[model samples]
Target: VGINVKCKHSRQCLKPCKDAGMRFGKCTNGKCHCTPK
Candidate 1:
């Protein structure tokens, strides 16, 4: 599901995600529940 999250059409969310220091979660979930530093 990681691929789905990254490929989500919501560019706004994805961009901020990466910009907000996002990363793959502990499991294989598609959302960045816990952002990294």
Candidate 2:
């Protein structure tokens, strides 16, 4: 399962996830989901 980071767009979520050490960040179902490294 992916972790929900709460965002409106991929670009908005990308930096936060990267900063948090997530491998991938994506917008899905109106939320930002993060993938583990």
Candidate 3:
């Protein structure tokens, strides 16, 4: 997690987190939980 993480919705969270590391992600418990791309 760097800074200014934008998770406008569950779908929105996917790309950014992936760019960070994995491929897809979901906003769980108010944070992006991602899996491999």
Candidate 4:
């Protein structure tokens, strides 16, 4: 499981989370679930 960062859209969350150093990111349950790098 990954950390949940608040998000409204998958497209909006993906890049920012990855840019923040997460290996991957996607919106789930209205949050950005980001995999650690």
Lowest summed lDDT window (length 10), candidate 3: 1-10
Writing each residue's lDDT as its tens digit, candidate 3 over 1-37 gives 3324646578877777767777657787666677663
Whole-structure CA lDDT of model 2 = 0.78
**Number of clashing residue pairs, candidate 3:** 1
Give a tens-digit lDDT track for model 2, residues 1-37.
Answer: 5666688668888877788788888888988777897
Superposition TM-score, candidate 3 onto the true structure: 0.52
Highest-TM-score candidate: 2
**Clash number for every model?**
0, 0, 1, 0
How displaced is residue 33 in candidate 4, in Å?
A: 1.0
Candidate 3's C-alpha runs over 4 A off are 1-6
Model 1 lDDT tens row, 1-37: 2322433334445565565566633322444333554
User: Which of 1 and 4 is ahead in lDDT?
Assistant: 4
RMSD of each: 7.2, 1.6, 3.3, 2.1
| Rank by TM-score (best first) | 2, 4, 3, 1
Choose 1 or 3, whichever is better by TM-score.
3
**What is the Å distance of residue 14 in model 1 from its true position?**
0.4
**Local lDDT at 33 for model 4:** 81
Clashes of 2: 0
